[model samples]
Target: MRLKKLYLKGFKSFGRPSLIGFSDRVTAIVGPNGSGKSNIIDAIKWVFGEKFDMIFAGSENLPPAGSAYVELVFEENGEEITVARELKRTGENTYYLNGSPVRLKDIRDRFAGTGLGVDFYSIVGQGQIDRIVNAYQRVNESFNRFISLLFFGGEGRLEISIRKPGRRDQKLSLLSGGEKALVGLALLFALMEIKPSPFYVLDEVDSPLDDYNAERFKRLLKENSKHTQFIVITHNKIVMEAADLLHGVTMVNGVSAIVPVEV
Candidate 1:
């Protein structure tokens, strides 16, 4: 899937409405504090039926006390589809696909096999990062011995005898943080052919990584863009440098406006 343009109106700080042109590969959003840099991410989620708190973190009613609208235009396969979402003062949400009314889940389901599935905060920190791939620890069905051994190593016989299976294997060293991210990117590419979406919005995904990993992250996205598009919200300069277009927002006369940049 590939994004062609974005049109937003009255949503959050986006007043006066804005239209952004996108490339097939990358788009960068950069700005100072309160510049609505994250609004783009919010808009994408909103069109897919996310509520105010989940999308904007405000109260439960009426688009957080303001009128708002969002629309995205893109090409999926060989078809151009336009999805528009509007919120009224009375808390009703209306969605249209190609100018026809449709359910939110139907909109979400359209991209299921395209490899565009995404979660906002799937970080791989030292804590639970290993949990997904870790081996189970259980022997003789004794909870006390297992718990004690986890904190305190047992005798050599006990240690060797109770050693858990699948615990000793190391992840391939060549696959660093960025490399893992790249592999994930490749998986997404392969996934899209089976289930397709035009683009992905990844927020703070580079936080758990170092500079070397960050560069890998950028390179992976660049390669991924050949098939799927990406909108990555990052404080890292590496991501910004890898973008094809940049859109920055700032307050002018107490209203948000897009500030275009050359990079």
Candidate 2:
């Protein structure tokens, strides 16, 4: 099972139809700041029930006053599953599983309790990553438990008192913003390993880390690709080096477009 392709239309900065293909292991999306690289990340989250306002790319309001949509195509268990959403304002959003009508809740339920989840802002912004690291400090003893639930899969019922006297403590916060970015993602990957998902879209996840941490992130992502097809969006040289394929993205006629770039 793997993602063969993804198609987007009238979604966020993707004002017109755009399509992106994936490699079995690694795919890199490179672009300068504000060039629609992060838009792709928002689209995946939208598929998982992320609201429009949270995106903050002028996606909060209707683009044209009618409707918009995003469709995802992939292979799961050797079968094709096409997830489609229609963003009309007048009626309930439409969902299609393999071209047939399905309830949004049904789609939600299907993805519920799986590693197909996403944490968009935390994966990119330095401020957000710092905030998460700060939160961990407040309850350092129980932070590991929260990380387990938030990143990996767990009951999330453990209390801070359950910790064995600061065993998870560190002399200094060794995690770079990029490493903090990886913390949540690595947890997601670990959870996905428990109940494997075939395709993944990780957008701009390495933007905030330095070279050393970027390399560590690359190693983790490469290791996780053993069971998941990944589309990693970043311009980091280290990440580009780790990628099996690299593509450049830019705004062409106000829509996101993709072109291959040598890695």
Candidate 3:
């Protein structure tokens, strides 16, 4: 499955309808701080069943009565599946799949046991260093398979144990933030390989990674792009250069917009 397009209306910094088309492989979203780049990722999470308050942005700027909506269109095995969610200031919320109304649980069930979650194991965000390490720490054969393949150069298993009777146990905690960031990327790819998502939206997951690890992360993303679409929000030049399409986000008078350019 691959995402085809994302549509947003009255959502966060986007006061009007906005549409973003995805490349089959990789799409990079670049923007200055406070330009609403991360909002795009949050909107996608909202349609996938995140909380209303989280999606609402805030009430300080919104009108007393208004509704916000986000829709995602995906191509799975040549068929289009649409998932959307909307909410009103009155606290009423609604969800839909393929234009038909559906319950929140129904949407949840659609991706249940499929390794798709509203947050973790699906969309990983900032300050999730521990979550990634924990996922890697678990001893799963399939996860080990990919971890060995890309990260370990098809060599021995990754010593990702939280307690391995030696320094390896404390290695994660003792490593620099940049090193931990690399582990986060590796863990994300390993889990995705095990449970295949239709797409992945990573927000500044490369912040602490230096050029060396960022390049490696790019290669891992390229290798998996055949099976999963990736939409990454990053400011790193190396990460941005790895993109198939670049979506430049800019804010003018507090209104955010996306300008897509082919790389």
Candidate 4:
């Protein structure tokens, strides 16, 4: 399954109807700061049945009651499916699939085994980077011990005991800032390979890295594009140049416009 297009209305800076199309391999979103580039990624998350609290409302211009809505269209095996969500101030939220009313779980179940799920790890955001680098507890013995009993039981504990005979585990904080960022990228690379998804959405995940690490990140995406689609939001020129299709976002009078350019 892959994203075909995104439709938005009355969401944050996007008051007018807006449509964003995606490329099969690499689609990069670029724009000036605060031009609603990250909003696009949030919209994708909303259409995936994320909580309504994540919905859009401009800083000062509160959206009209019942005016916020988002519709996501996806293509799978040559067939297209539509999932729509709407919000109202005084009424319960609404969900639709293929023009018929449905429940939130219905939308989730639709993408369930198709490599995309409600809590899909493929959507690597800023928080993910922090978790990967700053919170490296998993490398410690306590974390390993917990996983041992859950998986291999007594056998796993013995393996861990033997593996760390006299060595101490190193914390992520011991590494340099650049090394931390690269380690995060390395973790993501290994994760995608282990549990491959049909597509991924990366929202400024490269912002923390330097030029060298950023280039390596771009190369990782290029190598993975053959099997998985990547929808990236980035400001780095190297990352932009690696895109198969670039969408430039511009805000005029607080409204955002998306322009697709082939690269």
Estimate, for each residue in 1-263, the C-alpha lDDT of model 2 and write its tens digit: 66677777767667656788778888888887657588776676676566543221433333543456778777767777778877764555777877788877776666554445443322334454445434533334334444443333322211112112334433224533454565645444544434445566665666667887676677767766665667777667888876887778777544557677786
**lDDT at residue 204 of model 2 (Cα atoms):** 60
Report, for every candidate in turn, its global Cα lDDT versus the true structure: 0.57, 0.60, 0.70, 0.68
Candidate 2 Cα misplacement greater than 4 A, ranges: 51-66, 89-92, 115-201
User: Across residues 148-235, which tens digit of lDDT does each residue of candidate 3 receive?
Assistant: 4445433224545322222243445665677566655666676664555777777778877888877777776787677777888888
Encode model 1's per-residue lDDT on 147-222: one tens digit a residue.
2233243311211222223333234333355444433333333333434455666555555566775665666567
Model 1 TM-score, 2 decimals: 0.63
State residue 142's C-alpha deviation in candidate 2, in Å.
19
Residue pairs of candidate 1 with colliding backbone atoms: 113-194, 113-195, 113-196, 114-192, 114-195, 114-196, 115-192
Colliding residue pairs in candidate 3 = none
Which portions of model 4 show Cα errors greater than 4 Å?
51-66, 89-92, 114-117, 133-176
| lDDT (tens digit, per residue) of candidate 4 on 14-119 | 7668888888898999888868477877776766655444344453454443556888888888998998888765556788899999987888787765445467
Worst 10 residues of 3 by lDDT: 161-170
Query: How do all models score by TM-score?
Result: 0.63, 0.65, 0.78, 0.74
- Total clashes in model 2, counting residue pairs 3 or more apart in sequence or in different chains: 1
In what order do the candidates fall by TM-score, top score first? 3, 4, 2, 1
After superposition on all C-alphas, the RMSD of every candidate to the true structure, in Å, is: 11.2, 8.1, 5.1, 8.1
Task: Give candidate 1 regions above 4 Å deviation.
Answer: 51-66, 109-196, 252-254
Report the number of the highest-TM-score candidate: 3
lDDT of 1: 0.57
- Order the numbered candidates by lDDT, best leading: 3, 4, 2, 1
